[PDB]
Design a protein around this ligand. Sequence first.
Ligand SMILES: CC(C)C[C@H](N)C(=O)O
Length: 344
Amino acid sequence: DITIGVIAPLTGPVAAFGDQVKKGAETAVEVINKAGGIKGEKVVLKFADDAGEPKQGVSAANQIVGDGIKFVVGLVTTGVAVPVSDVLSENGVLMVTPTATGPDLTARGLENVFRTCGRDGQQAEVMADYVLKNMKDKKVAVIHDKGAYGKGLADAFKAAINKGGITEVHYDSVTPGDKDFSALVTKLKSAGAEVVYFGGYHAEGGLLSRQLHDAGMQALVLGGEGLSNTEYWAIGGTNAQGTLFTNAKDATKNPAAKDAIQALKAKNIPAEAFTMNAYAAVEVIKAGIERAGSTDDSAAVAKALHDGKPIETAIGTLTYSETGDLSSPSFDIFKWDDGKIVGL
Ligand SMILES: CC(C)C[C@H](N)C(=O)O
């Protein structure tokens, strides 16, 4: 059997992302096995919970190494991704991230790391352009969650709007697990913040959206794809109406997504971006193995994914750079409307 390890937060404040990655990876595996597996062999998933905690991610990685598993989909959050990557890479375990966007993951010399997603510099620059074009005159604030993702992302947005001439009226952070942001909100009111970019995840983002409105403000919340989960709406309520955030292009618009959509509909799983990217990550591993001709040498599989030939996936046709990033990444802006994600 061909074993694929999945390292993902199944418990804790970001288990909602984990759930998406698991279900995307799961659905891909069923379809491949239904379609005859790899070269005639069953693909199986083995799961290991990082709880969204980098120390526990290392531990999950270690278990993955100790089971002799050679392929991994996961490394979901940037903070976990990088420390997991080292453990995986040292021990000849190939890895594909469907969600981690922190640039450092692919800039430290690693030859067996890949993404089915882009990077923060691009998505912050996308939202910054939108801000400069459409909101040059708004009081803008920049907030993060002190996290590897949160701060990197928010600092990149800040840089891009300062370059375009906009001076933020406030820069600051909150601590994951703290739930009272009334102090920060107090400063936001008094700075007259009309727009607040938040680099972080839903547990914190939702609370910021809520507590802004309770203080009587009508501020527009902006962020990255950490605000793409419906839990952000669950937490934020109607206050999050209008929230804009960046994420990959809607994969459902491509005909390449036909097979994945049907398999998901059949299981009542929504075709969300992370879910699709996790499915495509399994497809990449399969394509790697097919081109290499082996399921035993992960280095050969890695070299094959890096050899310049394009790879067909549910999210589209991919070609990897020497760093393991996508060669043609792109990010669109979406908005939360009445609990649903909509374009434009
Ligand atoms: C699941 C995503 C919100 C994770 C985020 N892109 C990160 O790199 O941490």
